Design an enzyme around this catalytic site. Structure first.
Site, PDB file in Angstrom:
ATOM      1  N   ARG A   1       3.786  10.442   8.997  1.00 31.20           N
ATOM      2  CA  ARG A   1       3.130  11.015  10.794  1.00 31.20           C
ATOM      3  C   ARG A   1       3.402  10.393  12.019  1.00 31.20           C
ATOM      4  O   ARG A   1       3.632   8.648  11.811  1.00 31.20           O
ATOM      5  CB  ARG A   1       1.643  10.563  10.954  1.00 31.20           C
ATOM      6  CG  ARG A   1       0.538  10.759  12.164  1.00 31.20           C
ATOM      7  CD  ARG A   1      -1.054  11.496  11.237  1.00 31.20           C
ATOM      8  NE  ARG A   1      -1.945  10.031  11.020  1.00 31.20           N
ATOM      9  CZ  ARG A   1      -2.764  10.449  11.565  1.00 31.20           C
ATOM     10  NH1 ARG A   1      -3.402  10.728  11.739  1.00 31.20           N
ATOM     11  NH2 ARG A   1      -2.801   8.751  10.625  1.00 31.20           N
TER      12      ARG A   1
ATOM     13  N   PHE B   1       0.667  -0.955  -0.605  1.00 35.41           N
ATOM     14  CA  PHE B   1      -0.382  -0.311  -0.362  1.00 35.41           C
ATOM     15  C   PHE B   1       0.846   1.332   0.056  1.00 35.41           C
ATOM     16  O   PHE B   1       0.704   2.199  -0.855  1.00 35.41           O
ATOM     17  CB  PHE B   1      -1.269  -0.060   1.529  1.00 35.41           C
ATOM     18  CG  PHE B   1      -2.156  -0.972   1.244  1.00 35.41           C
ATOM     19  CD1 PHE B   1      -3.457  -0.131   2.142  1.00 35.41           C
ATOM     20  CD2 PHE B   1      -2.020  -2.159   0.449  1.00 35.41           C
ATOM     21  CE1 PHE B   1      -4.144  -2.103   1.937  1.00 35.41           C
ATOM     22  CE2 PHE B   1      -2.779  -3.151   0.790  1.00 35.41           C
ATOM     23  CZ  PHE B   1      -3.736  -3.016   1.031  1.00 35.41           C
ATOM     24  N   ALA B   2       2.307   1.612   0.554  1.00 32.69           N
ATOM     25  CA  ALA B   2       2.941   2.699   1.028  1.00 32.69           C
ATOM     26  C   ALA B   2       3.493   2.816  -0.323  1.00 32.69           C
ATOM     27  O   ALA B   2       3.385   4.181  -0.607  1.00 32.69           O
ATOM     28  CB  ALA B   2       4.072   2.866   2.013  1.00 32.69           C
TER      29      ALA B   2
ATOM     30  N   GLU C   1      -7.593  18.658  16.136  1.00 31.88           N
ATOM     31  CA  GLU C   1      -8.740  17.691  16.504  1.00 31.88           C
ATOM     32  C   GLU C   1      -7.657  16.961  17.542  1.00 31.88           C
ATOM     33  O   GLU C   1      -9.372  15.841  18.250  1.00 31.88           O
ATOM     34  CB  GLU C   1      -6.898  15.758  15.439  1.00 31.88           C
ATOM     35  CG  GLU C   1      -6.844  15.148  16.870  1.00 31.88           C
ATOM     36  CD  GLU C   1      -5.498  14.447  15.353  1.00 31.88           C
ATOM     37  OE1 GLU C   1      -6.616  13.602  14.660  1.00 31.88           O
ATOM     38  OE2 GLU C   1      -4.928  14.092  15.426  1.00 31.88           O
TER      39      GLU C   1
ATOM     40  N   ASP D   1     -10.921  12.023  15.313  1.00 28.58           N
ATOM     41  CA  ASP D   1     -10.230  11.943  16.506  1.00 28.58           C
ATOM     42  C   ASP D   1     -10.795  13.264  17.453  1.00 28.58           C
ATOM     43  O   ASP D   1     -11.105  13.392  18.804  1.00 28.58           O
ATOM     44  CB  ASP D   1      -9.061  12.610  16.796  1.00 28.58           C
ATOM     45  CG  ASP D   1      -8.051  11.108  16.838  1.00 28.58           C
ATOM     46  OD1 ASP D   1      -6.972  11.196  16.297  1.00 28.58           O
ATOM     47  OD2 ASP D   1      -8.531  10.811  17.840  1.00 28.58           O
TER      48      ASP D   1
ATOM     49  N   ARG E   1       6.337  -4.331  -7.095  1.00 27.90           N
ATOM     50  CA  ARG E   1       6.592  -3.115  -7.324  1.00 27.90           C
ATOM     51  C   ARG E   1       7.191  -2.105  -6.790  1.00 27.90           C
ATOM     52  O   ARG E   1       7.736  -2.991  -5.983  1.00 27.90           O
ATOM     53  CB  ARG E   1       5.193  -2.824  -6.260  1.00 27.90           C
ATOM     54  CG  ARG E   1       3.856  -1.339  -6.322  1.00 27.90           C
ATOM     55  CD  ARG E   1       2.764  -1.714  -7.210  1.00 27.90           C
ATOM     56  NE  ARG E   1       2.362  -1.820  -5.731  1.00 27.90           N
ATOM     57  CZ  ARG E   1       0.517  -2.323  -5.642  1.00 27.90           C
ATOM     58  NH1 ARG E   1      -0.104  -2.715  -6.541  1.00 27.90           N
ATOM     59  NH2 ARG E   1       0.243  -2.264  -4.732  1.00 27.90           N
TER      60      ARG E   1
HETATM   61  C1  LIG Z   1      -9.602   1.010   4.470  1.00 32.11           C
HETATM   62  C2  LIG Z   1      -8.578  -0.160   4.017  1.00 32.11           C
HETATM   63  C3  LIG Z   1      -7.624  -0.872   4.712  1.00 32.11           C
HETATM   64  C4  LIG Z   1      -9.112  -1.018   3.038  1.00 32.11           C
HETATM   65  O1  LIG Z   1      -8.235  -1.816   2.200  1.00 32.11           O
HETATM   66  P1  LIG Z   1      -8.129  -3.288   1.944  1.00 32.11           P
HETATM   67  O2  LIG Z   1      -9.434  -3.201   2.712  1.00 32.11           O
HETATM   68  O3  LIG Z   1      -7.464  -4.195   2.867  1.00 32.11           O
HETATM   69  O4  LIG Z   1      -8.396  -4.072   0.846  1.00 32.11           O
HETATM   70  P2  LIG Z   1      -8.683  -3.205  -0.526  1.00 32.11           P
HETATM   71  O5  LIG Z   1      -9.637  -4.350  -1.372  1.00 32.11           O
HETATM   72  O6  LIG Z   1     -10.214  -2.235  -0.258  1.00 32.11           O
HETATM   73  O7  LIG Z   1      -8.031  -2.616  -1.303  1.00 32.11           O
HETATM   74  C5  LIG Z   1      -6.346  -2.755  -1.454  1.00 32.11           C
HETATM   75  C6  LIG Z   1      -5.890  -2.353  -2.530  1.00 32.11           C
HETATM   76  O8  LIG Z   1      -6.207  -1.317  -2.883  1.00 32.11           O
HETATM   77  C7  LIG Z   1      -4.782  -0.414  -2.472  1.00 32.11           C
HETATM   78  N1  LIG Z   1      -5.063   0.363  -1.109  1.00 32.11           N
HETATM   79  C8  LIG Z   1      -6.478   0.728  -1.251  1.00 32.11           C
HETATM   80  N2  LIG Z   1      -5.897   1.948   0.296  1.00 32.11           N
HETATM   81  C9  LIG Z   1      -4.366   2.136  -0.227  1.00 32.11           C
HETATM   82  C10 LIG Z   1      -3.959   3.325   0.076  1.00 32.11           C
HETATM   83  N3  LIG Z   1      -4.006   3.918   1.554  1.00 32.11           N
HETATM   84  N4  LIG Z   1      -2.518   3.129   0.003  1.00 32.11           N
HETATM   85  C11 LIG Z   1      -2.319   3.135  -1.461  1.00 32.11           C
HETATM   86  N5  LIG Z   1      -2.932   1.648  -1.744  1.00 32.11           N
HETATM   87  C12 LIG Z   1      -3.972   1.343  -0.837  1.00 32.11           C
HETATM   88  C13 LIG Z   1      -3.430  -1.919  -2.388  1.00 32.11           C
HETATM   89  O9  LIG Z   1      -2.420  -0.893  -2.688  1.00 32.11           O
HETATM   90  C14 LIG Z   1      -4.725  -2.463  -3.195  1.00 32.11           C
HETATM   91  O10 LIG Z   1      -3.599  -2.744  -4.183  1.00 32.11           O
HETATM   92  P3  LIG Z   1      -3.037  -3.785  -5.350  1.00 32.11           P
HETATM   93  O11 LIG Z   1      -3.625  -4.563  -5.127  1.00 32.11           O
HETATM   94  O12 LIG Z   1      -2.154  -3.169  -6.412  1.00 32.11           O
HETATM   95  O13 LIG Z   1      -1.705  -3.682  -4.201  1.00 32.11           O
HETATM   96  C15 LIG Z   1      -7.579   1.098   3.202  1.00 32.11           C
HETATM   97  O14 LIG Z   1      -7.781   1.790   2.085  1.00 32.11           O
HETATM   98  C16 LIG Z   1      -5.777   1.242   4.551  1.00 32.11           C
HETATM   99  O15 LIG Z   1      -5.368   0.862   4.659  1.00 32.11           O
HETATM  100  N6  LIG Z   1      -5.412   3.408   4.030  1.00 32.11           N
HETATM  101  C17 LIG Z   1      -5.932   4.159   3.980  1.00 32.11           C
HETATM  102  C18 LIG Z   1      -7.175   4.216   6.001  1.00 32.11           C
HETATM  103  C19 LIG Z   1      -5.304   5.497   6.510  1.00 32.11           C
HETATM  104  O16 LIG Z   1      -4.432   5.636   5.575  1.00 32.11           O
HETATM  105  N7  LIG Z   1      -6.592   6.338   7.749  1.00 32.11           N
HETATM  106  C20 LIG Z   1      -7.364   5.436   8.358  1.00 32.11           C
HETATM  107  C21 LIG Z   1      -8.973   6.409   8.156  1.00 32.11           C
HETATM  108  S1  LIG Z   1      -9.920   5.233   8.630  1.00 32.11           S
HETATM  109 MG   LIG Z   2      -6.703  11.704  14.402  1.00 32.32          MG
END
Ligand SMILES: CC(C)(COP(=O)(O)OP(=O)(O)OC[C@H]1O[C@@H](n2cnc3c(N)ncnc32)[C@H](O)[C@@H]1OP(=O)(O)O)[C@@H](O)C(=O)NCCC(=O)NCCS
Ligand SMILES: [Mg+2]
Ligand SMILES: [Mg+2]
Length: 720
Positions: free
Chosen positions: A335, A122-123, A430, A458, A308
């Protein structure tokens, strides 16, 4: 005590070695001096970190007691808050002086992605999300209804893809209008005399504003792509008559790429679970690979082995013929955690754990040096053209706590041999004591601040905890309509714009948590740039590309000039506590929803060390859960419980109702272990129970003490 002693610190080996072997080389910092500065900095600042934590505790007990003696006289309440030092006077007007900041921050209005730094996959994706396909975003989500045969399937569906193309053609018309006619009728593009010429059935046309032509790729007379710009964000039309989509397109257009996540926040805080030196080393290492540019992650598409990596920069021809380059990667913030927690990664002689926020500055500062230059030993990536390191500091309460961060950064800069004010601060707004003193918080950081941001989740958690004793609060889905939050949002913008943020620093707003509901995001989330926010948070690349649409429709710089210097929120509004005036079906629904979301989030935190999850609520809406959405649910229930709307038995029964549902949501995850029917043998179930029944006792309602302790329990039990 595989721990290396250095001064009065006892440093976990895994951390020591990671720092010396991986982080330090290439930074030109002498390692002995590094470690002795870590020691000096920890010894000098710890007592003030503790004093500031004690003050939060002192303020809350006074507030609890005030409510317990006490229909709220708001004058008497303001007064009391003034006397105990909670609400301080607003300073004289000023303008921030922060300098050496990149344009992605000072100037470019656009989406900001947040991502758990422990998840390399994801990062990477997030850093790569500065540039995203609008076609994939439209085709892959509910933005384009699956209506009239436009349903997704095994194969490309041309009915659906034609809808995507049209949607993108209209977007191009709205953002970069031709002098005459529509992009919908384009047959081809050329570059002539350094202008973009768009071929129509009549008719060739230029752009109504030719300054929106930024460059191209391929030959002038037959370009492989056309780069456009609007509101400082780039739009790239990829042209390929021979591509699967291209052959079906009137101009052989293959895709439209939007510049989306101009900045990204690599998160150590609420989206990750990191409870010990091993976990912190994992995230610092990923932060390291990002700044060096060599981070990678194996990725599987259709049983073929891919890797990737970070995107390289993008090469273009200038309209007038010269070559240039746009960044391939979003600018990265990191962060750090806030002031609260300690971590056992370092302990002193008495075995007391060291404040984690102090460590994060030191270690994430140290590693960020690699992204300030390109070399073999630093890696090819440069994260800032100006030499700044960008750190989001969450969960601060008031100006003294901001000044303490700034002093921490200053101390760290001396240890790292960096100029003063290298380390920039993105201030989360927050916590209530920050909101109601926001101008003084900005002021305390006037030479470092690069953003303020309404961390509304928050912020609601603090709202509930602060007034815990005042009475029962409204239901959490009813919070959005309360005067406190509406004033909070306008007040944040007011204070940033009055401090001269326009052209200098981001005014940011919060996260869209409904990961699947993108048609809704595109319809609703436009309110945030319209309110003056130069950036707002999105949960995924796909959501970044979609949110970017809004920055093309709204001219945020023009919004900001039209709001600047105008006061819209009053103190009294900011301090209006969301006290309720419920049928039992309404209490049941609230409790069960809060319980389901707590359990579904905690069980993967505790059992798996996942700090951000997608968890369906009671209505089946897939919600992004992190510690802050947890803070709200567990505090609302602790507040209902405190005031006798629900009993302990009620909570337990609800938790037992919903545990089997969470177990079902998680079946088919081979690593999942169910909570039911043996609730008391489940450390994750007990965590969720404890977060609710001990909730009122948690400092500022924070979830980390119970979660860190329970995750460690779980690791310890997994170990024997
Ligand atoms: C909610 C979350 C866990 C959903 O992800 P998930 O349930 O594991 O899986 P999904 O099927 O919806 O998505 C996975 C895919 O989307 C991408 N993805 C989802 N969130 C991503 C993010 N923040 N950054 C980059 N890619 C992301 C993944 O890389 C993956 O794609 P890939 O197969 O090419 O690697 C997620 O979007 C996340 O961990 N990130 C942002 C939330 C955050 O940082 N703060 C919390 C706020 S409530
Ligand atoms: Mg917060
Ligand atoms: Mg580098």
């Amino acid at each position: 005590t595989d721990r290396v002693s250095v001064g009065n610190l006892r440093i976990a080996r895994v951390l020591y070695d990671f720092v010396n072997n991986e982080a330090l080389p290439g930074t030109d910092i002498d390692p002995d001096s590094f470690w002795a500065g870590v020691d000096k900095v920890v010894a000098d600042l710890t007592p003030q970190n503790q004093a500031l934590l004690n003050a939060r505790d002192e303020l809350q007990a006074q507030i609890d007691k005030w409510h317990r003696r006490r229909p709220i006289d708001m004058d008497a309440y303001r007064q009391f808050l003034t006397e105990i030092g909670y609400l301080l006077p607003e300073p004289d007007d000023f303008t921030i002086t922060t300098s050496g900041v990149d344009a992605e921050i000072t100037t470019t209005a656009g989406p900001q992605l947040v991502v758990p730094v422990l998840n390399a996959r994801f990062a990477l994706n997030a850093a790569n999300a500065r540039w995203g396909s609008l076609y994939d975003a439209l085709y892959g989500t509910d933005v384009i209804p699956e209506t009239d045969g436009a349903e997704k399937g095994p194969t490309y569906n041309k009915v659906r893809g034609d809808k995507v193309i049209a949607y993108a053609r209209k977007f191009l018309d709205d953002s970069v209008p031709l002098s005459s006619g529509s992009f919908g009728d384009a047959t081809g593009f050329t570059v002539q005399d350094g202008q973009l010429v768009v071929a129509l059935p009549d008719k060739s046309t230029g752009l109504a504003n030719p300054g929106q032509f930024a460059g191209y790729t391929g030959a002038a007379e037959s370009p492989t792509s056309v780069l456009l710009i609007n509101h400082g964000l780039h739009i790239e039309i990829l042209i390929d008559p021979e591509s699967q989509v291209g052959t079906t397109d009137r101009a052989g257009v293959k895709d439209v790429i939007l510049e989306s996540a101009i900045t990204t926040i690599m998160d150590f805080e609420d989206s990750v679970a990191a409870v010990d030196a091993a976990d912190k080393v994992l995230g610092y290492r990923n932060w390291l690979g990002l700044n060096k540019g060599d981070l990678a992650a194996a990725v599987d598409k259709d049983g073929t082995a891919f890797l990737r990596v970070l995107n390289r920069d993008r090469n273009y021809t200038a309209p007038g013929g010269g070559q240039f380059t746009l960044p391939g990667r979003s600018l990265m913030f990191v962060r750090n955690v806030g002031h609260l927690m300690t971590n056992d990664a370092i302990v002193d002689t008495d075995g007391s754990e060291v404040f984690e926020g102090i460590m994060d500055a030191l270690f994430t500062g140290l590693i960020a040096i690699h992204g300030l230059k390109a070399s073999d030993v630093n890696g090819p990536l440069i994260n800032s053209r100006t030499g700044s390191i960008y750190i989001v500091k969450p969960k601060m309460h008031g100006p003294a706590e901001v000044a303490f961060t700034c002093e921490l950064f200053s101390r760290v800069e001396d240890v790292l041999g960096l100029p003063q004010n290298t380390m920039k601060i993105g201030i989360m707004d927050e916590e209530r004591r920050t909101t109601v003193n926001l101008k003084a918080c900005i002021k305390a950081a006037a030479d470092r601040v690069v953003f303020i941001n309404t961390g509304f989740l928050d912020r609601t958690g603090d709202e509930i905890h602060t007034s815990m004793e005042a009475g029962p609060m409204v239901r959490k889905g009813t919070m959005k309509s309360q005067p406190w939050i509406l004033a909070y949002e306008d007040h944040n913008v007011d204070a940033g714009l009055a401090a001269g943020f326009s052209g200098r620093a981001q005014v940011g707003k919060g996260m869209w948590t409904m990961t699947e509901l993108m048609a809704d995001m595109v319809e609703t989330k436009i309110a945030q740039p319209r309110a003056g926010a130069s950036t707002a948070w999105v949960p995924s690349p796909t959501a970044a590309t979609l949110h970017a649409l809004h920055y093309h429709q709204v001219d945020v710089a023009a919004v900001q000039q039209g709001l600047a210097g105008k006061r819209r929120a009053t103190i009294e509004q900011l301090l209006t506590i969301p006290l309720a005036k419920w049928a039992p079906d309404e209490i049941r629904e609230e409790v069960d929803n809060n319980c389901q979301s707590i359990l579904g989030y905690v069980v993967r935190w505790v059992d798996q060390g996942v700090g951000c999850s997608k968890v369906p609520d009671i209505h089946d809406v897939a919600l992004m859960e992190d510690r802050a959405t947890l803070r709200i649910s567990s505090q609302l229930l602790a507040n209902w419980l405190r005031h006798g709307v629900i009993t302990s038995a009620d909570v337990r029964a609800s938790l037992e109702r919903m545990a089997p549902l969470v177990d079902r949501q998680n079946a088919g995850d081979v690593a999942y272990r169910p909570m039911a029917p043996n609730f008391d043998d489940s450390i994750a179930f007990l965590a969720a129970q404890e977060l609710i029944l001990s909730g009122a006792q948690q400092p500022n309602g924070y979830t980390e003490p119970i979660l860190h302790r329970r995750r460690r329990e779980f690791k310890a039990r997994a170990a024997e």
